Design a binder for this molecule. Structure first.
Ligand SMILES: [Zn+2]
Ligand SMILES: [Zn+2]
Length: 548
């Protein structure tokens, strides 16, 4: 009941096998209008018509798994996700005719092969054919197509299609295979903004999250080689060749969690902020620099986000890794020595129980990084830190004074926001990493006469100007809860061409999103499940739309 139709001439289907395809559209997630959310369009490669149920379930699995990683998780309910059921004549492994002519080259890179059947512009199909039709028929903006992609253009072959990657934040192509491969194609000046990953490889979800890190978050491969020249140094979001810690772009993050600049290989001139990142090796999480940069990138596409508050940490303050000269050795072994030293001093998250009665007279530091997303309003955050007894009470010194401290930090405006992948940008040239960025450190001396008890821990809060708690000592290990979204007609029927997925949120989160006025041509009636704390797995939020 919901589909788009394409007209593919010889440049896109030279053998005529997909000259006029009908493509069913499935909505996996639609929590707001497409103008308010980041739109993700996923197509299938090497799935025959009878395998489209497998494709939709594969897209839901890979998507739900990608949304478990920060920074994507912080925006999980701000994406609209659509699965386009592109049918191939053959499965990918059987090797016959497929919708996207994907081949795996000698370097294990998956590519759309224009020369497989002579379709000269096959790898331009997303922005010249699928994108404009989807943006006209399905996307809430309903932008009319203005170009015929099968006729010879009189001017630029690229400029008429630049709008496609502003309405569609990302194109993803999932290949029906167990083969292990991954490929990201980002070059907006030449219309490319898609990636190719497999449905069933041993690391399928990890590959998907990594490739999405290039496409959506604008991040580079952290296994990259070479010395970055000035233009490449300024352009890169998460790589650097600056050996001086006083000048490196991410100097404010040094010593925050596992952030210690190091070479990405022996003798390498390419430096990374952490050796343990998914952008270098798919077995890891996103590093703090990738989390910050990716959060900043997505804030440009969903503009109701005001602040980034990295999860604070508490460590015993010994003086180690407290000044730039402590970060001059860039060997990978120096990164690992740094992480062992941090483990030995950690007093937060899973190491909260490492606080003991021998902490009297010792200093402790509450540290985090904050990014202001506003280019207009400066912010003031208040940090509170105290020593709390196992029975909730606040520990005191030998005179009855509580072992508590407070500090206020100013967060400057993000003045350079227009240079950081704003909506409509074709590239990234230069940006000031420190614009709107503030590393916050509260160093408190535990009194020599502190009355410490067995089971005491460090408690803390980060508060906004109105006293709202943005983060606390329970944040790092807080439970996440699974939410399921369902789409129904007024009579209770599941809306055809919907395949409602799940995402996770911090326990107690109140979802406050304005539902889209329409789902396909159905008008919104009501929603059950919003503006109420999510405190159970399998919590269902049901969106009701009126049938035609
Ligand atoms: Zn990569
Ligand atoms: Zn990283």
């Amino acid at each position: 009941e919901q589909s788009i139709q394409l007209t593919l001439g010889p440049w896109y289907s030279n053998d005529g096998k997909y000259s006029n395809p009908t493509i069913p559209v499935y909505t996996i997630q639609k929590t707001r209008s497409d103008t308010e959310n980041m739109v993700v369009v996923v197509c299938g490669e090497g799935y025959t018509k009878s395998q489209q149920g497998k494709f939709i379930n594969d897209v839901k699995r890979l998507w739900q798994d990608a949304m478990k990683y920060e920074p994507y998780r912080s925006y999980a309910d701000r994406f609209n996700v659509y699965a386009l059921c592109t049918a191939s004549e053959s499965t990918f492994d059987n090797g016959g005719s497929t919708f996207f002519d994907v081949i795996v080259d000698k370097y294990n890179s998956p590519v759309i092969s224009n020369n497989l059947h002579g379709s000269q512009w096959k790898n331009h199909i997303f922005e010249r054919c699928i994108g404009p039709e989807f943006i006209e028929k399905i996307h809430d903006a309903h932008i009319k197509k203005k170009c015929d992609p099968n006729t010879i253009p009189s001017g630029s072959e690229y400029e008429p299609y630049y709008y496609v990657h502003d309405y569609i934040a990302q194109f993803a192509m999932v290949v029906n295979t167990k083969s292990d491969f991954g490929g990201a194609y980002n070059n907006r000046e030449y219309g490319f903004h898609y990636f190719i990953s497999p449905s069933d490889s041993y690391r399928a979800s990890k590959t998907f999250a990594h490739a999405f890190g290039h496409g959506l978050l604008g991040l580079g491969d952290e296994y990259s080689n070479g010395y970055l020249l000035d233009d490449k140094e300024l352009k890169s979001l998460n790589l650097s060749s600056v050996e001086d810690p006083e000048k490196i772009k991410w100097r404010q993050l040094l010593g925050f969690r596992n952030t210690y600049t190091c070479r990405n290989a022996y003798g390498s001139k390419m430096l990374v902020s952490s050796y343990e990142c998914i952008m270098r090796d798919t077995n890891y999480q996103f590093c703090e620099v990738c989390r910050l940069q990716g959060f900043k990138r997505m804030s440009q596409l969903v503009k109701d986000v005001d602040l980034y508050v990295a999860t604070p940490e508490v460590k015993e303050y010994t003086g180690a890794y407290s000044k730039p000269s402590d970060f001059t050795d860039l060997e990978t072994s120096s990164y690992y020595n740094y992480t062992y030293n941090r483990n030995d001093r950690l007093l937060s998250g899973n190491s909260k129980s490492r606080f003991n009665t021998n902490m009297n007279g010792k200093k402790i530091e509450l540290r985090t990084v904050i990014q202001n997303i506003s280019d207009k309003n400066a912010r003031q955050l208040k940090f509170k830190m105290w020593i709390k007894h196992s029975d909730g009470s606040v520990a005191t010194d030998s005179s009855g004074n509580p072992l508590q401290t407070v500090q206020t930090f100013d967060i400057p405006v993000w003045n350079d926001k227009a240079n950081f992948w704003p909506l409509g940008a074709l590239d990234h040239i230069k940006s000031d990493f420190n614009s709107g960025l503030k590393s916050c450190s509260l160093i408190y001396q535990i009194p020599s006469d502190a009355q410490l008890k067995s089971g005491d821990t460090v408690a803390f809060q980060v508060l906004d100007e109105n006293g709202n708690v943005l983060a606390d000592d329970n944040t790092e290990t807080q439970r996440y809860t699974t939410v399921s979204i369902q789409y129904k007609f007024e009579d209770g029927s599941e809306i055809p061409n919907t395949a409602g997925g799940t995402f996770t949120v911090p326990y107690g989160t109140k979802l406050d999103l304005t539902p889209a006025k329409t789902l396909y041509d159905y008008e919104f009636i009501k929603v059950d499940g919003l503006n109420k704390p999510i405190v159970s797995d399998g919590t269902v939020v049901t969106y009701y739309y009126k049938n035609l």
